[model samples]
Target: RPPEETLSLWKGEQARLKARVVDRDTEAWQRDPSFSGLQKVGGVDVSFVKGDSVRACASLVVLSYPELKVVYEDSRMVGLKAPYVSGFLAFREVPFLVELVQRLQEKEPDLMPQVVLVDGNGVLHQRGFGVACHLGVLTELPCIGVAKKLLQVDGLENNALHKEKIVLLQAGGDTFPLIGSSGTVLGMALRSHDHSTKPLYVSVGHRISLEVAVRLTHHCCRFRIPEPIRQADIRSREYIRRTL
Candidate 1:
């Protein structure tokens, strides 16, 4: 299919997925019903070989929450069929991640993550459906997008939160928020660590609230990036180094 045609098809799919997204503070228990605890958090990330975007390594690392110790980790190298597109990243990266999670569930169900942290934008997309939102809806698990940069979508505004000069986004209101055009508050720009000049863009992926997502992202940050995601990124690069 032509790139334009493919883009159009994916846009429709994105709309369908966006409609399914809760985009609210719907607790995990409300979705899981029998959810007993949140012992483990899983993070997924993809690293491309230097100067080679088509070949990439995707990794999933499950960590014991609060403790933040690595419990299980897996990585897979995938060949991308489609070139990188701004809003259609999930089409390229998510298949392997979904497979990685399904394999984990089949083999290591105990380590199946209660919530997942995705290294991409969530509702902070042009269509209000980014890779994290796509993954969350597909996996049916709570997910949060922890991105280093903002998507600069419509109605998203950047402002300093305090004297520290940390970035806080005002989506629509005067207050610090990332609200979309449809009156939906999409995400938030947060300073994860003290004295860090950079801010992390956080948003709801599936069945989690923005408040809890921000709190958890802050809690997981020993460095700028959340530990789970940082671990996944480190191990993914390590896997690439070992394999090639």
Candidate 2:
């Protein structure tokens, strides 16, 4: 297909997927005992090879809940047919990440995570559907996006949050409460660690609430980034370093 056609196709799909997103907390998502009592939590991240963008490495790390010990870890190198597009990152990376998650569930269902943390934007994207949201919808599991940087949608940086503080951010005006063009109050701007000016943008992926997501993200932090995603990032780079 032509470049324009491909862009249009992905854009349409993103728009349709955005409609399927449940921005508000369902009773189950907010009240499930298992969610609060999570034993296993998983984190996922993707990295491209030095000279290759179409081929990449995806890593999944499952840690024992509050302890944050590495219970299970794995990596996969995947070939992508679609090139990386600005708003279509999920198209390139989601397939491998989803495959890894499915394999983990099928092979070791006993160790399946109650929630997942993804190293990407969730509703913070331009279309309000990001890789974390895509993976959560696909896996039908509670997932959270722990982005290192703000996507800057609808004046995301206009908040007054300070270091080591968290604030509920509504990207747009608060006329309709938390609702916004990009989406509702997707999540919070949190400074997970002190002495750092940057904050993690946490957003709900699926079957999860922003409040829970923020709390959990904070719980998993020993540094600026959450432990789950930080471990995934370290492990992915270590895997790449060792193998290639």
Candidate 3:
């Protein structure tokens, strides 16, 4: 159950806060370093068993851009803080991701990739904060949400540019339309329209732009699914199958 204060805020103040964030994004993004020629990038995917056990895993799959080679991989399990909410995914899963990041940091602190591709949403949300955007802001790293279904927003578009305020999408028999927010639009989603049915959701997470997110998704995607997530999915399922 949401607290009365937060519930009211979402109903009213959330919109104002979201508008402020989008309006000031240009200046806020300036704090981020320029990662124009980033060769090595990281992709993270989180999955878990829906039960009392709370066994959640976050995988980090590092790939080489252009080449799209898999260089590094890591996975970790952690406790879930809250029940799954349509908009509050970060509160439930980001702890596990931060744990995985800590392990990655042990190997190399400054070796964090120029950007991180998350399996969640960024700024294309009612609060200007989804799991991807929430974690991105906390870590000060760029993140992207690549969900199989939409849960928070509504009216997911297909193969066309979206101009909505909050597009919580659920993937069904249709494409996963990646929506960009503010004055930034994802360039990749605009250019790559090979498939008429399936579209990926692209939103601004943290210090990154929607254009780069889509471009990187296309670049890392070799056999349909992107390398970071595709490989992470396979590894996660296998791990679950072996253990459970």
Q: Which candidate is the best by lDDT?
A: 1
Model 1 per-residue lDDT at 43: 93
Residue 215 of candidate 3: its Cα lDDT? 58
**Cα TM-score of candidate 2:** 0.83
After superposition on all C-alphas, the RMSD of every candidate to the true structure, in Å, is 4.5, 5.0, 6.7
Measured against the true structure, the TM-scores of the candidates, in listed sequence, are 0.86, 0.83, 0.70
Candidate 1 overall lDDT versus native: 0.80
* Candidate 2 residue spans exceeding 4 A from truth: 25-36, 157-184
lDDT of 1 by residue, 1-244 (tens): 3367899998999998888887666665434433335678899998888878678898999998678899999988888767668888888888888999999989899899888999998878888789999999898888998888777788665534332234342221112466676787777777776656667888888888877777777767788799999999998899888877
lDDT of 3 by residue, 18-53 (tens): 432331233333343443467667787766774544
Among all candidates shown, the one with the greatest TM-score: 1
Model 1 lDDT-worst window of ten: 167-176
lDDT string for model 2 (47-122, tens) is: 7778775667789989997799999988877787777676688888888888998899788888888888998888
Question: In order, what lDDT does every prediction score?
Answer: 0.80, 0.75, 0.59
> After superposing candidate 3, which stretches have Cα over 4 Å from the reference?
1-36, 50-53, 151-196
